[PDB]
């Protein structure tokens, strides 16, 4: 039983999970899925949020289980994505020393937002609102349908479930503050939102981060959230390769249906038009690398993250020069590439 087992698991120290658990080299997708709820509790305890906010541990256990259950099983947008995004939030706390830059409550909200940010994703994305089917239209678009309102609504539905409100003992002001933070942070996972605020993020990085500037706190939270969402690109080759398989398996299931029903899919969802290495390069150069470059500009200790993403972009570039990979094979695996690179 998940609940009894999670109650019996108490709250472990992070040293009981792995000595590298707080390292940027750690791959949280290596952790067995049955141990991830325990790891969530361990991270919250290690960041001192359980004690400092007087969180009821049974209520938190139930909350964690409800959030996990609120994910479906498409290839990419599942609980293991939310878990690995949440783990990266913890890595930023530990390695960038976020308490020196943000309030305790903003960091707590960021972590809970990471857990909840893709709730009830069904492996479909019809959000781009572009007339072209080109990947470039998608990579530049700053408007869309905002699916992220639903993810937030699912989070609030969990909090409004009897026995699951981890914040119900908060003051009315702190309760509203937490929910407003969750809304803003979850809405920030929309790439259209990121593209709307990009110029303001650049301006912040140019002038320098001001810990006394409240607009800078807002912008930084958005940047950190997107950096958590894309953190699979900051690990090694095997992670970026595996995640590309998942992203495109998910995309192609949508696109295959759209094509079958006589509709034009986005080109990145059309297995006949989607050159995966080239698409990965484009996403990394347009979206991911600039995010981690901004992060490095604000936090010199984040330099290794940018350099990992850049290294992974160069791996995909080598792949693109040696292979023409249009769509995915019938088994959805490009794992032969691991031996090709070394
Ligand atoms: S790391 C990563 C993350 C997402 C995607 C798919 C993808 C998603 C959105 C856009 Cl606008 C473009 C692409 Cl190509 N690919 N790689
Ligand atoms: Mg999302
Ligand atoms: Na996503
Ligand atoms: Zn996500």
Residue numbers in the entry: 580 to 921
List sentences quoted exactly from the publication behind this structure.
It is the most abundant PDE subtype in the hippocampus, a brain structure playing an important role in cognitive process and cyclic nucleotide signaling which is implicated in neuronal plasticity and memory.
The crystals contained one monomer of PDE2A in the asymmetric unit. The pyridazine hydrogen bonded to key amino acid Gln859 and formed a pi stacking interaction with Phe862. The new crystal structure showed a previously unseen conformational state of the protein. The H-loop (702–728) covers the ligand in the binding site in contrast to entirely open H-loop conformations typically observed in published PDE2A catalytic domain crystal structures. Nevertheless, our structure of PDE2A catalytic domain solved with 5 had the H-loop folded over the binding site but allowed ligand placement for binding energy calculations. In addition, the folded H-loop contacts the bottom of H12 and could stabilize the helix.
